[PDB]
């Protein structure tokens, strides 16, 4: 089957010389192409995209003076050795110095007072307390008494954060941010600090958007926050570094975009401790006693959130995108074929054109549909075609007769490409077995009148022995047969001559049923000496 | 070429009125559509997805009492100022106090004893030691001697972590987790704490799955771990916050899912220090000497792993997905066309239907294949068609003759749409040049018998001068020619009349080869007065 | 419309028995299939990919001796309790001990000297200073005077980092890295340490590439850096853990790849403080005074960057990819159809084949194009076809005549499938209204000569009453009509007989325009007794 495989199958097409459909087809082609090109370029769908790998190094600069005598805060005093994605700047603080692990009364709170030891419970762990009770109601001061606890003593008082913030001059502090980013898939590395950047720059949204030295108060202004107010209880501020990087040589750009967003929830419910603070202890020994200064530090935690993508041209990405948009170029074909199949219907003239006469020249689709689509029937064993000489159409009786004569069984109308049922006076009763008799109980005409076998052309197109012999010799020029063999060939050829004449197409002539008058006239002209006639047999 | 471009080409189609193929085609259309719709909706393939940008703020609450007198541990004692993605809770500890940078003997280990200075090596750095040897085997105690080292003295003893853990009451500690998440591409921000959440809630997998206050022991229970056992040597616990967020207005939901997973490897080999611990020093001065208390802290490091995606409807994402699934609607066409092309073969009746008679009504595909596919031959210069009057088929001799007469060169069988090689007694030797003689050495019949030129229709269809003149005038109604011009046109028309009659289609009649008898009978009826006959020439 | 929906439409195709096109079609099919398969397998486009969730635990090991007497540095002295994605190793340091919050002169800098109090400014905050000026120029030493500041005193001197680094023996330190990774979507967890790994291993790029114990100097060597030189001022070193993980059972592999990259910028401008350092303070009390030792620590920050993807087979991913590459199998059809449509043009023989005769056997595409494409015209109301008996082509006059006789209005040439304008002497003036007269002002021939109505076949094909009656009876075998009805049917049938004869196809015969001579000869043979002749009317 080497020749069976080496074959090419091409579609048969009808090329229409129509300027309307040629223009519509090309207009739809540009619309699809314009959107496909726009989607590819705007979304960089030809690029293989990769998340960024970031490293952040921060350096805070600034000195603070706190009036309380005067204490100095440099970077070692309000910051911590961490210089990565997060750094903390202390803006407020409460101190409780000289704490010793011993027994002491609780600080008087909203419910920390007691009047008897029955109120205190030994081993109890008050969620708002920093010690474990011993069940003793010792005196805190002269006025009131509080339950004794095991804790660092004296316990930290429920003192609010100072207002204004002790280190609110941190607004004028600056942080330098060094961001190293990398794309391991594309093997590309860059940093946020350009060689042109000087140390005297400060970030501005419009004047210096690439300087990575930020004033803290400027950061808060750009986020819509008030540094002075947030400094009292603290908060979390997000410094977002966005990297939209194009690594293609012809459109190369890998630069950061700086934005600022508060990550603290200012509407935090009071039970969740709004703001940002933590407690840390400075441990020291004094008089052979382990002492501790406890500091509740308020301030801003700055989170450096670095995100972004690096794209570079990928051939496989482009191939996948192009293949995923190739089917959209069939839109013009779908639309115009729908127009052809829809405007070729008979309800167009019946119930559309009289209303709207602007659509009148769309009758050309009836011609287009004729040249495009050919309808065929499934050749089932019960497929029958009936033509009546007194009718302009052809009936298709595709159902089983079930003993009803074919004359009375009406079928679907199809355009042409002595017995009780007889209406011409020439038909004869079927000589088939009684089960199949209803097939041959067909007349040449539906309504009474002249028989078709009495027409001039019936003797010329069907019964002429010379013409049938000429057709037989056209099939086989050197043909010698006996009378019995010749009669059978002439009889079967006369059936086809009637079927072709009255039904036109061989598709319908194959399942055409001869009327009884015509069938028996043919059988009289070319008789069968011995045996009975088979009748119509299913061609498949 | 304005009219050349403004054209529309449509496919020629055969519409089959078959309920089986119409049902199969629609059933396959629903199957493709059902899967395409299901894949799009279940996977949200219409959405542009974005990784989350997360910020975590944690607050641990709890007080611990350690029995050793009694020491108090509050958050400043077992936690560190870090409150981001990681926080540490100390659950056990070993202390070595009053260390001084001086010379001291090594602690007695499995191989730290010595009996001579030759065992010790000056400057040696034992991997299991905390000092550098000086080559001297000083006495540690009365029983044994150990190598002298430069270290903080005395060196920390090889003491195991206490069992049970000193701060195993950390099981009852709680952590509040504040998670701020953001989708910069979609510009959406939310947090894990809803306004409905109260401070008295505790997380439960089924009762309070949205409360972000977690008991540490509950975290360990939900991970399948035992807090009490892990507390002795420490470990790493992962708190996973998963954000499956739909940002479409009609299906909006952005809420976290909490899961817990141990990140420590409990099956760690002993050389890799299983558990979690670190050594830190509390530095202080005493008697003008730089002293240090060294603490080996065991405990749980909690990692807050926040991940997830935020999806919102994207038109370009939907267009790409739809275009990438449009080709699947050709599946019905492919399947039914395969059925038509396969069940139309002759081996169906030969070796399939006798076995299985259920497939018998599939003979309709032979009719479908006839109305769908037309087979044509490549018109190569060696393409020849031969018809023998005593055969029912037509031979295609597509090979070069190479001096073998065309009568004997057998070719592929194709259905019809005096010389030694002669078998009819009427053929004449070719008058062509000897190289091309084998072309015209063809008889009308394969086996001996009557010549086709003696048939009645040969004189009527091929030789009739009146009919050929009528055909010529049909071509050109007003045609005047001399006898030499008329004879040439009549002779060439008689070749085509024979070729059309004996081969049917003009595709095969173009390459049909006339038998010598017919060719010379035609040339006798319409002779060429001067010159020689060209013979058959390749039409392309 | 149950039968209207249950229909199947198949394309009509031409199957070409060509080995060249069959081979080209299959070769292009393998090329598309080979690339589609290669792209799918190399890029794992059948897999659903997921970013990794990582947890890192590090442990640094090593002791350092610093010569300054001799001070010992163990992990508590050069590292910090952080053991996650970042750890710091101190390699150099400058100490300023015994600092007290008081008033002191500034350290003499390049511009810190003063000669009068007018130079100093009270409250000034020098960016290079660690205090706030009080406007007083106190003496620092005997030689020079500096402005008094409020700071920790004495202020840290502008001392360079020691060279060589004090803790450059950190080169021989080792870090053990434990990496737990997870794929929450695929529910897969693994770690970087295999059970086969022993504690005596050290990482080597080729000898032990899976051991996660790294010498720091080896890390710097693998990054192309010098640990000894970087140790003086510090730097940031990236340890990259790449996880290319295949989670399919038949190709399972999830192992890390270790690479090293310096994240510090060695070419940093001096104003941005190149290297890596931070200042931290050791707070202590002495003589009831809050004292502090300030250390400027230089060293290497190591960032553990863990990235990667985990892929597992996804059915929806495969379906989307296959559907997005199905349209590429139409490439063979597009190419071969382009070959057929292009090599069938007449400029091939005119201006291509004489130059290149290798392309000569490509004339078979003219035959292929004939069997594939049928061209039809849009049936517009101004569509006219004209045939002249003295011409070999047929003119298409698709434009409006606008009073110009159809004889003179030339149209496009189309191959056949008494009055002043008359050139045959038999034409008659039109009897139509004057506006439409130009339609019927057409002669049978362009140039003077014999009329076509004087031909023998005109009386046989057009005027023969017997033949027209036979055609009428073929339409309707039992037809009885009056002379007026018979004449109208015979006249209209004779128009079609002329149009079919002279134009061939019914597509062109529908819009064919009869010459005046033929029209009036037909109207003379079959006259209209009463009324006037309608003439040609638009068939649509
Ligand atoms: N289409 C069609 N074919 C028929 C009809 N009647 C008979 N035939 C065909 O005639 C052939 C032989 O039928 P018949 O002459 O009655 O049987 P026979 O005398 O034994 O050969 C069969 O192949 C039938 O297909 C008819 O009404 N319509
Ligand atoms: N198909 C076919 N055509 C033939 C054959 N023999 C001759 N012809 C055609 O007849 C035409 C003229 O051949 P011929 O009459 O022998 O040469 P002429 O007398 O010089 O015109 C050529 O165009 C041939 O294509 C044949 O056997 N088969
Ligand atoms: N194609 C074509 N059809 C024509 C021409 N002239 C007349 N007819 C057709 O002839 C039919 C009747 O025209 P005519 O005999 O002149 O009018 P009538 O005598 O009133 O029936 C119309 O349907 C026309 O389509 C012609 O030149 N070309
Ligand atoms: C009557 O049918 C003749 C009309 C000829 C022009 C038809 C134009 C129809 C409008 C375009 C329809 C296809 C586009 C559909 C949207 C993609
Ligand atoms: C004989 O061929 C007649 C059978 C008519 C119904 C054919 C049904 C075949 C089963 C469906 C085949 C196409 C689906 C293939 C799987 C996608
Ligand atoms: C003349 O046209 C006959 C040539 C027969 C073989 C044609 C081969 C052409 C080369 C292949 C063209 C299609 C591939 C285009 C690149 C994808
Ligand atoms: C910030 O600096 C400016 C100018 O140096 C000063 O006017 C302002 O008071 C400062 N803000 C704070 C909060 O100290
Ligand atoms: C910031 O908040 C403080 C209160 O702490 C207020 O006095 C000040 O006016 C605010 N600044 C602005 C610009 O609103
Ligand atoms: C946790 O608390 C419960 C009730 O307060 C107590 O019974 C239990 O012993 C505690 N667990 C530890 C480890 O302290
Ligand atoms: C947890 O481990 C401890 C050992 O440290 C054991 O005594 C206790 O029974 C364990 N708890 C459970 C629930 O298994
Ligand atoms: C590292 O160790 C080797 C061998 O122990 C030694 O020779 C070398 O001097 C050491 N390097 C440093 C910087 O101490
Ligand atoms: C590393 O740098 C030091 C300078 O600090 C230099 O002495 C040494 O030779 C360098 N090592 C190499 C291998 O270049
Ligand atoms: Na497609
Ligand atoms: Zn009858
Ligand atoms: Zn009848
Ligand atoms: Zn012969
Ligand atoms: Zn012969
Ligand atoms: Zn004329
Ligand atoms: Zn004329």
Residue numbers in the entry:
A (entry chain A), B (entry chain B), C (entry chain C): 6 to 73, 84 to 432, 473 to 595
What does the paper say about this structure?
To characterize the molecular differences between key mammalian P2X7R orthologs, we obtained cryo-EM structures of the full-length wild-type mP2X7 (2.5 Å) and hP2X7 (2.5 Å) receptors in the apo closed state conformation. Conserved features include their trimeric architecture, the 310-helices forming a closed gate, a partially hydrated sodium ion present in the closed pore, palmitoylation of residues in the C-cys anchor, and zinc and guanosine nucleotide-binding sites in the cytoplasmic ballast. There are also hydrogen bonds between the hemisuccinate group of the outer CHS molecule and the side chains of N261, H268, and K49 (distances of 2.8 Å, 3.4 Å, and 3.3 Å, respectively). Although all three ortholog reconstructions are of similar resolution (~2.5 Å), there are no densities in either the rP2X7R or the mP2X7R reconstructions to support modeling of CHS molecules, suggesting that these bound CHS molecules are specific to the hP2X7R. However, the identity of three residues within the classical allosteric pocket are different between human, mouse, and rat orthologs as seen in sequence alignments and visualized in their respective structures. Second, F108 in hP2X7Rs correlates to Y108 in both mP2X7Rs and rP2X7Rs. Finally, V312 in hP2X7Rs correlates to A312 in both mP2X7Rs and rP2X7Rs. The larger valine side chain in the human ortholog occupies more space within the classical allosteric pocket than the alanine in rat or mouse P2X7Rs. Residue I214 in hP2X7Rs and rP2X7Rs corresponds to a glycine in mP2X7Rs, introducing flexibility in the mouse ortholog that could explain some pharmacological differences. The larger side chain of V312 in the hP2X7R (A312 in the rP2X7R and the mP2X7R) forces an alternative rotameric conformation of Y295 compared to its conformation in the mP2X7R or the rP2X7R.
The P2X7 receptor is an ATP-gated ion channel that activates inflammatory pathways involved in diseases such as cancer, atherosclerosis, and neurodegeneration. When present in high concentrations, such as in pathological inflammatory states, extracellular ATP acts as a danger signal to cells by binding to and activating the P2X7 receptor (P2X7R). This spatiotemporal signaling stimulates the innate immune system by triggering assembly of the NLRP3 inflammasome and subsequent cytokine release, as well as activation of various less understood signaling cascades, ultimately resulting in apoptosis. P2X7R antagonists bind to either classical or extended allosteric ligand-binding sites that exist within the extracellular domain at the interface of two protomers.
